[PDB]
Amino acid sequence: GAMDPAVMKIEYYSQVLDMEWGVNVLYPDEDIPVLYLLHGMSGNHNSWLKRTNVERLLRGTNLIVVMPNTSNGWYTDTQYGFDYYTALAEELPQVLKRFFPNMTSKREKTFIAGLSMGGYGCFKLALTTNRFSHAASFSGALSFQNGSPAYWRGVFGEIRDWTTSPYSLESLAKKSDKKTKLWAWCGEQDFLYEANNLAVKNLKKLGFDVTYSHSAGTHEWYYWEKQLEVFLTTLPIDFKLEERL
Amino acid sequence: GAMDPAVMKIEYYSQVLDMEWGVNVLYPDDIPVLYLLHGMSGNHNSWLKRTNVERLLRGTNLIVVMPNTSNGWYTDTQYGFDYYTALAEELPQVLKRFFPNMTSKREKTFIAGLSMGGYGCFKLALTTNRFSHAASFSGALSFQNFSPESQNLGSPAYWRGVFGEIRDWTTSPYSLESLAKKSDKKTKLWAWCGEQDFLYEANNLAVKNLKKLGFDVTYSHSAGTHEWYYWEKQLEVFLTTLPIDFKLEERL
Amino acid sequence: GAMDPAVMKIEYYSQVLDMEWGVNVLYPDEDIPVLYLLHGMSGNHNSWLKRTNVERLLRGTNLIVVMPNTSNGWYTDTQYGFDYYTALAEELPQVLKRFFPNMTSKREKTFIAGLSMGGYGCFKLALTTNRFSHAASFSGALSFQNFSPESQNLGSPAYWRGVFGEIRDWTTSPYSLESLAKKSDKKTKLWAWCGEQDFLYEANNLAVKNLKKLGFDVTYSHSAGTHEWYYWEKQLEVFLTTLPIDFKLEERL
Amino acid sequence: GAMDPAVMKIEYYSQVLDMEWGVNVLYPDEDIPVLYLLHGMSGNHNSWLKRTNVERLLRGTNLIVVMPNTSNGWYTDTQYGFDYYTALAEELPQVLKRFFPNMTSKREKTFIAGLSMGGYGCFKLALTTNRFSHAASFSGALSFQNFSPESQNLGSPAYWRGVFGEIRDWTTSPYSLESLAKKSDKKTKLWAWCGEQDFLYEANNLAVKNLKKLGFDVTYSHSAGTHEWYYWEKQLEVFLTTLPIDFKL
Ligand SMILES: [Ca+2]
Ligand SMILES: [Ca+2]
Numbered sequence: 001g002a003m004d005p006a007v008m009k010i011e012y013y014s015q016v017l018d019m020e021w022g023v024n025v026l027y028p029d030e031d032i033p034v035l036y037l038l039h040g041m042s043g044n045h046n047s048w049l050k051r052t053n054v055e056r057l058l059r060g061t062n063l064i065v066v067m068p069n070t071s072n073g074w075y076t077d078t079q080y081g082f083d084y085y086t087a088l089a090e091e092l093p094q095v096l097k098r099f100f101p102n103m104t105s106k107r108e109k110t111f112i113a114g115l116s117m118g119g120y121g122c123f124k125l126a127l128t129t130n131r132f133s134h135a136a137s138f139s140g141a142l143s144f145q146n147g148s149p150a151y152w153r154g155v156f157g158e159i160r161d162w163t164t165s166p167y168s169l170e171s172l173a174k175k176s177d178k179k180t181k182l183w184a185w186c187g188e189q190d191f192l193y194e195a196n197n198l199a200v201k202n203l204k205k206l207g208f209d210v211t212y213s214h215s216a217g218t219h220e221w222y223y224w225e226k227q228l229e230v231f232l233t234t235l236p237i238d239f240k241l242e243e244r245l
Numbered sequence: 246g247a248m249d250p251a252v253m254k255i256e257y258y259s260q261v262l263d264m265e266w267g268v269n270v271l272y273p274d275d276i277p278v279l280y281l282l283h284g285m286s287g288n289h290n291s292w293l294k295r296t297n298v299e300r301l302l303r304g305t306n307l308i309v310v311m312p313n314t315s316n317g318w319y320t321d322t323q324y325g326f327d328y329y330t331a332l333a334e335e336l337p338q339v340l341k342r343f344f345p346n347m348t349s350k351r352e353k354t355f356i357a358g359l360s361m362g363g364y365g366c367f368k369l370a371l372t373t374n375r376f377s378h379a380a381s382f383s384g385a386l387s388f389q390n391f392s393p394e395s396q397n398l399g400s401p402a403y404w405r406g407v408f409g410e411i412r413d414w415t416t417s418p419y420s421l422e423s424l425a426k427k428s429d430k431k432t433k434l435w436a437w438c439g440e441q442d443f444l445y446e447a448n449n450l451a452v453k454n455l456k457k458l459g460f461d462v463t464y465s466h467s468a469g470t471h472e473w474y475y476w477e478k479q480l481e482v483f484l485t486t487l488p489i490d491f492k493l494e495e496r497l
Numbered sequence: 498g499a500m501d502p503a504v505m506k507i508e509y510y511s512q513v514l515d516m517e518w519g520v521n522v523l524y525p526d527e528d529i530p531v532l533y534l535l536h537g538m539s540g541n542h543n544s545w546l547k548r549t550n551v552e553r554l555l556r557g558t559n560l561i562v563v564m565p566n567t568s569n570g571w572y573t574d575t576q577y578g579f580d581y582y583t584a585l586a587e588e589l590p591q592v593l594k595r596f597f598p599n600m601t602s603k604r605e606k607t608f609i610a611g612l613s614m615g616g617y618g619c620f621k622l623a624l625t626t627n628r629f630s631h632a633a634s635f636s637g638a639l640s641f642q643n644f645s646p647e648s649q650n651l652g653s654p655a656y657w658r659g660v661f662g663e664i665r666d667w668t669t670s671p672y673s674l675e676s677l678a679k680k681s682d683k684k685t686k687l688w689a690w691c692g693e694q695d696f697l698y699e700a701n702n703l704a705v706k707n708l709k710k711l712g713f714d715v716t717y718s719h720s721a722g723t724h725e726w727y728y729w730e731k732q733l734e735v736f737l738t739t740l741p742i743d744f745k746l747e748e749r750l
Numbered sequence: 751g752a753m754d755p756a757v758m759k760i761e762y763y764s765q766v767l768d769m770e771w772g773v774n775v776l777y778p779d780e781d782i783p784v785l786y787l788l789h790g791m792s793g794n795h796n797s798w799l800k801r802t803n804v805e806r807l808l809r810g811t812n813l814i815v816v817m818p819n820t821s822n823g824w825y826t827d828t829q830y831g832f833d834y835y836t837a838l839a840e841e842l843p844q845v846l847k848r849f850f851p852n853m854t855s856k857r858e859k860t861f862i863a864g865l866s867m868g869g870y871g872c873f874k875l876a877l878t879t880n881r882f883s884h885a886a887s888f889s890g891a892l893s894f895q896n897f898s899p900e901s902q903n904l905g906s907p908a909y910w911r912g913v914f915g916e917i918r919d920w921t922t923s924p925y926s927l928e929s930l931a932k933k934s935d936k937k938t939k940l941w942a943w944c945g946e947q948d949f950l951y952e953a954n955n956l957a958v959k960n961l962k963k964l965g966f967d968v969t970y971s972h973s974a975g976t977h978e979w980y981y982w983e984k985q986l987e988v989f990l991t992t993l994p995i996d997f998k999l
Contacts, residue, residue, distance in 0.1 A: 001286055001517075006596070007294070007508040011796065013501055013526060018905075019792050019822055020498065020800075027596060042246055042768050046761065050252070050299050050770075056473055071821065072769060072832075080830040081909025082822070099503070099524060101598045147768075151831025154912070189497075216497040221300055245441075245468035245475075246770070249763055251849070256543065256757040257779065263652075264569060265541050265751075272849060274763070288517050290508065315568065316516060316579075324577040325656025326569075343756070343777060345851050399515070403578025406659070498792050504800070539751060547757070552800050553979055726806060750947075750974040 003029070003060040007049075012095055016087040023092060024049060026058050026065035030102035031109065033237055034064045036132075038075070038114030038121045045069040052225040056242065063237050064103055068092055074155045075121030076167070089125050107179075108133045113231055115224040116192075117141055119184070123169050127176040136183040136231040138224040139190050142169060142199035163202075170202050182210040183234060185227040187217030248274050248304040252293075257339055261331040268336060269293060271302055271309035275348050277489055278308045280376075281480075282319065282358030282365045285385075285398065289313035296477040300494065307489050308347050312336055318407045319365030320419070333369055352377045357483055359476040360444070361385055363436070367421050371428040380435040380483040382476040383442050383469075386421055386451030388414040396443055415454070422454050434462040435486060437479040439469025500526050500557040504546075509592055513584040520589065521546060523555050523562040527599045528606065530742055531561040534733075535572070535611030535618045538638075538651065542566035549730040553747065560742050561600055565589055571660045572618030573672070586622050604630050604684075610736055612729040613697070614638055616689070620674050620704075624681040633688040633736040635729040636695050636722075639674055639704030641667040644697060668707075675707050687715045688739065690732045692722025753810040755779060757799075762845055766837040773842060774799060776808055776815040781854050783995050784814045786882075787986075788825070788864030788871050791904065795819040802983040813995050814853055818842055824913045825871030826925070839875050857937075858883045861993055865982040866891055866950070869942070873927050873957075877934040886941040886989040888982040889948050889975075892927060892957035894920040902949055921960070928960050940968045941992060943985040945975025 008025035022045050037054070039047035045067045048054045058065060073084035097103055104110060111134045114122035119140015126135035144162040152159075156167050163170050182203065186196035193214070200212045211234075217223040232239040250271035259266040269289050281298070283291035289311045292298045302309060317328035341347060348354060355378045358366035363384020370379035385391075388411070393399050411417050418424075434455065438448035445466070452464040465482075469475040484491040505522035521542050534551070536544035542564045545551045555562060570581035593600060601607060608631040611619035616637015623632035638644070641664070646652050664670050671677075687708065691701035698719070705717040718735075722728040737744040755776035764771040774795050787804070789797035795817045798804045808815060823834035847853060854860060861884045864872035869890020876885035891897070894917070899905050910917075914925050921928050940961065944954035951972070958970040969992075975981040990997040 001510055002512065004510055006510070006592075008596075009506040009508075010503060011800075012503040013499055013792075015499065017822075020501075020794055020796070029595075042763075042770060044770055046770065050249075050761075051297075052300075053295075053297055053477075055294050056296075072767075078830070079908065080828070080912030081906045082912075095503075098599070099505075100596065102595075148831045150829065154828075154830030154832075218495065218497075220495065222494055222496055242472065242474050243470065245439075245470070246763055247765060249770075251763070251845075252761040253849075254759040256547070256759075258539075258751055258754060258756075260752065262569075263539055265539060265543065265547075286510075286515050286517060290517065294508070294517075316514075322577070323655065324575070324659030325653045326659075339756075339779075342779075342852075343758075343850065346848075400578050402576065406577030406579075501800075547805050548803075549806075550801075550803055553802075747980055748976065748978065749980055750945075750976070 005055060005058045005065070007055070014087050014091060016083050016091045021087070022069050023096070024067040025096070025100075026055065027100070028058070028062050028064065031104050031106065032062060032064050032102050033109040033235075034066060034103050034111065036066050036068065036112040036125070038068065038112070038118030039070070040114070040116030040118045041072060043118075044071060051221045052228070054225075054228070057229065057232070059242070061237060061239055064100070066092070066096060070121065074117055075124055076155055078154055079157050080154045085124075089129055107131055108236070111135070111235060113138070113228060115139055116219070120169070123182065124172055126180045126182065127169065127172045130175075130177050130179065132180050134181045134183065134235055136227075137185070138227045139186050139192055139219055140184065140196065141192060142184070143195040145198060146194055169199055170206065173203060173206050173208065176208070178207055178209070180209075182208055183231055184210065184212045185230070186214050187219065187223055188214050189216065189218045191219060250274065250299065250302045250309070252299070259331050259335060261327050261335045266331070267313055268340075269311040270340070271299065272344075273302070273306050273308065274304070275350065275353065276306060276308050276346050277353040277487070278310060278347050278355070279487075280310045280312065280356040280369070282312065282356065282362030283314070284358070284360030284362045285316060287362075288315060295473045296480070298477070298480065301481065301484070303494070305484075305489060305491055308344070310336070310340060314365065318361055319368055320407055322407055323409055324406050329368070333373055351375055352488070355379070355487055357382070357480060359383055360471070364421070367434065368424055370432045370434065371421065371424045374427075374429050374431070376432050378433045378435065378487055380480075381437070382479045383438050383444055383471055384436060384448065384451075385444060386436070387447040387454075389420075389447075390450055391444060391447040421451055422458065425455065425458055425460065428460075430460055432461075433486075434460055435483055436462065436464045437482070438466050439471065439475055440466050441468065441470045443471060502526060502552065502555045502562070504552070511584050511588060513580050513588045518584075519566055521564040522593075523552065524597075525555070525559050525561065528601045528603065529559060529561050529599055530606035530608065530740070531563060531600050532740075533563045533565065533609040533622070535565065535609070535615030536567070537611070537613030537615045538569060541568060548726045549733065551730070551733065554734060554737070556747070558737075558742060558744050560740075560744075561597070563589070563593060567618065571614055572621055573660055575660055576662050577659050582621075585618075586626055590628070604628060606630070606741070608632070608740055610635070610733060612636055613724070617674070620687065621677055623685045623687065624674065624677045627682050627684065629685055631686045631688065631740060633732075634690070635732045636691050636697055636724055637689060637701065638697060639689070640700040642673075642700075643703055644700040648696060674704055675711070678708060678711055678713065681713070683713055685714070687713055688736060689715065689717045690735070691719050692724065692728055693719055694722060695724045697724065753779070755805060755808045755811075755815070757805065764837050764841060766833050766841045771837070772819055773846075774817040775846070776805065777850075778808070778812050778814065780852050781856065781859065782812060782814050782852050783859040783861065783993070784816060784853050785993075786816050786818065786862040786875070788818065788862070788868030789820070790864070790866030790868045791822060794821060801979045802986070804983075804986070807987060807990070811995060811997055814850070816842070816846060820871065824867060825874055826913055828913055829915050830912050835874070839879055857881055858994070861885070863888070863986060863989055865889055866977070870927070873940065874930055876938045876940065877927065877930045880935050880937065882938050884939045884941065884993055886986075887943070888985045889944050889950055889977055890942060890954065890957075891950060892942070893953040895926075895953070896956055897950060897953040927957055928964065931961060931964050931966065934966070936966055939992075940966055941989055942968065942970045943988070944972050945977065945981055946972050947974065947976045949977060
């Protein structure tokens with residue numbers, strides 16, 4: 001309907017991945033603000049569309065939403081020759097800006113959010129690029145300090161100590177100018193609650209602006225959507241939630 | 246994920262419409278079937294675009310079929326598009342060919358719709374006698390006491406395209422009351438409307454008339470307007486009335 | 498692969514149609530030329546992608562291709578309240594300009610093409626908008642003066658009345674290309690092909706004759722051929738070689 | 751139109767890959783024959799739909815066409831934990847059989863074809879499963895004994911290691927079609943075409959020679975052509991004429 005976002009289901013060639021690849025875009029209704037919205041493990045670019053009311057949530061909101069695909073590659077340039085980090089941090093923004101010149105190129109209007117694996121990817125991209133002003137993690141896999149062996153090796157190689165490896169958010173934080181607002185939620189009955197506690201505590205000590213919340217909840221889409229609703233209210237976009245009598 | 250429905254987006258040729266046409270189907274991980282009908286301005290993508298129906302169906306043994314009537318009111322129109330025949334007769338035949346494991350039993354065959362889709366839902370239930378349960382969410386269930394111009398909906402030519410010239414709605418062949426003559430009364434009818442919906446009085450009237458005709462109608466109403474948030478909530482309630490062992494997601 | 502166009506399946510709201518609606522876009526891999534490519538009766542915005550190799554054809558070509566949907570409404574503001582002409586001639590270009598500012602807004606680089614019902618729609622939009630430099634019809638339904646849908650039992654009386662109302666005489670009705678031509682500045686290069694074994698061949702001969710009499714720039718070609726996708730695909734290939742876009746046909750040894 | 755195949759674009763969960771995954775199906779519009787149609791490198795389940803007139807080709811043909819996705823994984827259970835072979839050889843057919851009970855479960859009505867990487871994957875599935883009666887390769891990557899991907903700027907050392915591990919000699923490796931052929935009952939008709947100007951021409955010549963030596967029924971053709979979709983579409987047409995489906999043109 002009127003005020004609902006247009007939806008762009010995009011098939012594009014990734015030179016970085018040497019693959020025909022996919023992204024979804026929600027386009028409002030120029031310097032239009034952008035939110036990158038990252039899926040978790042087992043997911044892809046369709047996840048937020050399949051698993052939440054993000055479309056309804058974006059009604060009347062001047063915000064472009066970009067949903068990338070990392071296909072179980074952890075937003076990482078992998079050991080097996082698939083450069084997912086490069087494809088999504090570098091190539092995708094270039095591809096989209098070419099299609100959509102009215103999308104903002106300003107940090108203060110560029111945001112990121114993800115759930116689980118996407119929570120890790122979100123914080124990683126926020127810390128390494130310095131191109132985002134706000135970054136949100138919902139039940140993120142924020143630390144491995146506390147699949148299959150071949151699978152995990154494919155992502156991270158051999159890991160002795162997670163926190164001191166270049167893959168930890170603590171280590172990636174060294175690349176950050178610390179000017180990104182970080183936002184995190186985790187359910188208190190989530191298996192990743194303690195990983196979130198450790199990562200948040202570390203990032204705060206390292207001097208980062210981290211707004212961490214936690215409440216009753218488990219590792220489920222209902223909660224991640226609810227927390228996206230909360231995160232959107234923190235953005236400079238004048239968001240309004242639907243009436244719910 | 247595991248237990249989530251498969252989604253198939255189907256491009257098929259409608260011989261009835263003489264059109265390339267489309268439908269969406271959710272297929273679970275003699276399987277019951279729910280036909281889920283869109284409203285005005287909508288199409289076969291509406292329920293997927295506007296609700297968490299996909300997430301709602303996790304772990305539930307139910308095929309969901311989403312047809313498209315493209316603003317044609319689930320009606321064989323005045324302008325040569327036989328949408329009723331295409332969706333009531335052709336689509337079920339097409340899908341049965343693809344999906345032989347879909348039930349052919351009335352007791353396992355259901356339909357639901359919102360607004361124009363609530364009208365279409367009750368029309369199909371009353372005319373076919375092939376459904377056991379039929380639900381309307383803020384349905385356009387009568388035009389006797391509701392005029393679309395009060396809400397700047399369509400135009401005189403558009404309405405004439407669907408229904409022709411209508412002197413009196415209820416006594417016309419298009420009313421649910423008139424269409425009810427084709428019904429064996431053995432379909433459970435289920436309706437909700439928000440008390441702040443422009444269609445509240447239309448629902449009140451149609452429900453009273455169908456009950457007076459001896460239909461089994463379960464009508465509920467509460468705070469609410471003409472919005473997707475409510476239709477999604479009421480689909481959730483309706484699913485609990487079906488013989489499908491549905492359980493809602495955890496919400497702490 | 499590399500050099501292949503990106504494909505955009507677009508779900509947008511049409512205020513004109515009061516509908517959730519759709520279009521497909523091929524976007525080359527900056528004032529980029531655009532071709533609007535119109536489907537025929539029984540088709541939709543998916544037709545050219547489903548029924549031809551247009552995607553493979555556009556490899557390495559700097560041209561955006563827009564495939565709209567008129568859903569059997571003849572690119573016409575109908576008698577039953579669906580304003581397909583306004584939706585496609587007016588609203589769609591505005592919607593696309595907003596999404597794609599790098600798409601050209603110049604007549605010199607804006608083109609249109611269509612098969613059958615889409616050939617009619619193509620010439621109609623070319624004549625009435627003055628926004629296109631080149632317009633191509635493939636086996637177009639260019640006249641109903643000497644063609645009747647009753648010859649092949651296409652549609653139904655109610656269907657045709659739904660599109661055009663009651664017509665005494667096609668050529669003198671406001672729906673004819675001959676009537677619609679009055680809105681044209683005559684600056685569009687019109688291009689038409691029709692197969693000699695097509696039910697629409699004489700309709701093409703007549704429309705072409707009439708438009709040339711009115712002083713239009715019309716290039717008309719015909720050869721053995723029938724009312725089939727094989728021919729429409731072949732003629733699209735020919736049309737692309739005529740456009741100011743550096744098109745090169747794939748190798749076929 | 752009338753007689754054209756229905757198209758279903760399918761999103762399903764792959765337990766084997768722990769992925770939301772995809773396949774396309776053309777369904778003719780009862781024991782219906784099935785063709786698995788495999789994409790090449792850089793492609794996916796959409797490849798044959800995007801790059802050919804396969805839809806038009808199948809008008810009036812009683813054949814289901816299944817297009818899987820191996821996402822640059824070479825139809826192989828990889829060294830990095832993605833079991834593409836198992837997902838496509840075992841899981842996908844079980845998934846589709848559940849949706850479509852009218853699809854054949856007979857070997858004599860089950861066929862497979864692929865281009866490039868898909869030619870390799872096709873012959874691999876045919877040799878290993880013994881569940882197909884006819885298998886076709888179009889410009890297939892049928893051997894790496896005499897072809898190095900580096901010559902065409904394809905992949906990277908890390909990429910190839912991810913698929914095949916370290917390879918001292920291709921033909922004697924368990925990954926070669928020659929080695930995979932040990933699992934075959936030889937009761938699958940193999941069909942191959944390659945362009946005489948294709949960079950994979952010599953790889954085809956070698957694999958065909960070897961499979962013939964091993965006692966396989968291999969129909970191999972070659973003519974003018976390069977590594978392009980135009981040729982693969984034409985050759986799919988020729989392959990269809992060899993199938994027990996009364997294909998028309
Ligand atoms: Ca959705
Ligand atoms: Ca295609």
